[PDB]
Ligand binder design. Structure first.
Ligand code: HEM
Length: 188
């Protein structure tokens, strides 16, 4: 995982569960509770999974529940660290932009494996978005969508069409319906 993001996660964990749970979880994996993660640092994914498992243990919450909660809250952390991506944006616009954003923010890393998040209109008031990644972070993905809905104050309906692994990649396809029309048919 890219260091910058793991950093936002540590902060989000502190905002949700407190400094004691977080400092202890970090120590459990050999980290200094106040460790400084550089932007381009490549934090091992399992190491992050071990931190979340420890948070799970200490909080009594299911680890998937924690990822879901971190995803909802991390949007707020994101708007504070990367305000430029939210500045005068609408939810549909924000989401359609994500696949490109993840590519741009990892292009400086050789062999980068960002999640693919291709989205496409499928109705005047709905889009289909497919999470594709080897990391299997379904709940984080679903939580970020829910958190995004809350940030932009735009109500949505999220239908999980399919989830599973195809050719080594975990995939989750959702259909996101908005309260109002957001698309119009136009000449291709
Ligand atoms: C403007 C806010 C956002 C920024 C700056 C951002 C940035 C990033 C970056 C740099 C990574 C690390 C990728 C890697 O190390 O390979 C990441 C991971 C991830 N992002 Fe975002 N992201 C944002 C919002 C979102 C949203 C809204 C979604 C979902 C629709 C999303 C889905 C994910 C997921 C699921 C991962 C976890 C890694 C994986 O599953 O492979 N992100 N994000």
């Amino acid at each position: 995982m890219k260091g910058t993001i793991v950093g936002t996660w540590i902060k989000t964990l502190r905002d949700l569960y407190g400094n004691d749970v977080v400092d202890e979880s970090l120590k459990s994996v050999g980290w200094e509770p106040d460790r400084v993660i550089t932007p381009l640092e490549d934090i091992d994914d399992d190491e992050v999974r071990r931190i979340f498992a420890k948070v799970s243990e200490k909080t009594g919450k299911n680890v998937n529940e924690i990822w879901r909660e971190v995803g909802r809250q991390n949007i707020k952390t994101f708007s504070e660290w990367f305000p430029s991506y939210f500045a005068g944006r609408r939810l549909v616009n924000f989401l359609m932009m994500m696949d490109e954003v993840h590519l741009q923010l990892t292009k400086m890393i050789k062999g980068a494996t960002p999640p693919r998040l291709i989205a496409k209109p499928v109705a005047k008031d709905a889009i289909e978005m497919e999470y594709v990644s080897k990391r299997k972070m379904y709940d984080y993905f679903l939580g970020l969508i829910e958190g995004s809905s809350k940030f932009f104050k735009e109500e949505i309906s999220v239908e999980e069409v399919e989830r599973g692994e195809k050719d080594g990649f975990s995939r989750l396809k959702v259909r996101i319906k908005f309260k109002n029309p957001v698309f119009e048919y136009k000449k291709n």
